[model samples]
Target: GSSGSSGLEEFKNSSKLVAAAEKERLDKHLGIPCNNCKQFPIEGKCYKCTECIEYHLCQECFDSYCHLSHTFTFREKRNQKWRSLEKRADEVSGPSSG
Candidate 1:
C-alpha cells in the first residue's frame, strides 16, 4: 500500500539524517588537530582532558611529552572506543624498557 511505502521512505530518510549527524560529531574529535604542533591528522592517538573539556593532545604531542599526571581519556584514530588513561598506561608506555 502507498501508506506503508511512505512510512518506509520516511524512516529511511530519518535514519540517514541521524547517521550524518553522528558522523559529523565523531569527526569533530577524530579529525582534531594537535594542540602542541597544530597538525591536522585523522589517524593518531588522542588525549582528552577529564578535568577540562578544552584541552586535547594528538598522538604526536601525546607521545612527545608527559601528560600522564593528568586525568584523561584516550582514543586511537578512527576507533569509536575511549579508554581511561590509567587503563591504557601500559599501551602508552612506549616499547617497554624492561
Candidate 2:
C-alpha cells in the first residue's frame, strides 16, 4: 500500500525537476536583447538571419526590415535549438504543372 504512494511522490519530484530545467534554459535563451527593437524580452517572436552571421531581430523589426524576404529562422521552444522558417524559391523543385 505505502509502496505505491511513495512511487507517486518520486514521479512528481522528477517531473518538477524536468520542468524547472526547461524553464531555466528558456530564460537564458531569452536573455539576449533584440537588436532591432532593443527590447530586453522580445515581443511576438525572435528571429536570426541566415545569411548575416550573428544578426538578431525582434518580431516587429524583423517584419519591418523585411528579413522574411530571405531565408531565416525563429526560436520559440524552451530548447535552445533554432527552428527554420524560410522557404527559398530555389529549394522548391516541384513541377509548376503539377
**Largest TM-score belongs to which candidate?**
2
Alpha-carbon lDDT, every model: 0.56, 0.59
The C-alpha local distance difference test score for the whole of candidate 2 amounts to 0.59
Q: State the number of backbone clashes in model 1.
A: 0
Q: Candidate 1: global Cα-lDDT?
A: 0.56
Worst 10 residues of 2 by lDDT: 1-10
Query: Which residue segments of model 1 deviate by more than 4 Å?
Result: 1-30, 77-79, 87-98
Q: Per-prediction TM-score, please?
A: 0.47, 0.48
Segments in model 2 whose C-alpha atoms lie over 4 Å from true places: 1-31, 86-98
Q: How does residue 12 of candidate 1 score in lDDT?
A: 22
- Itemize residue pairs with steric clashes in candidate 1: none
Write down the RMSD of all candidates, one decimal each: 11.7, 12.7
Model 2 C-alpha lDDT per residue in residues 9-93, reported as the tens digit of each score: 2232222344323323344347366665666555357787778866778778766655666677787644345677756445356
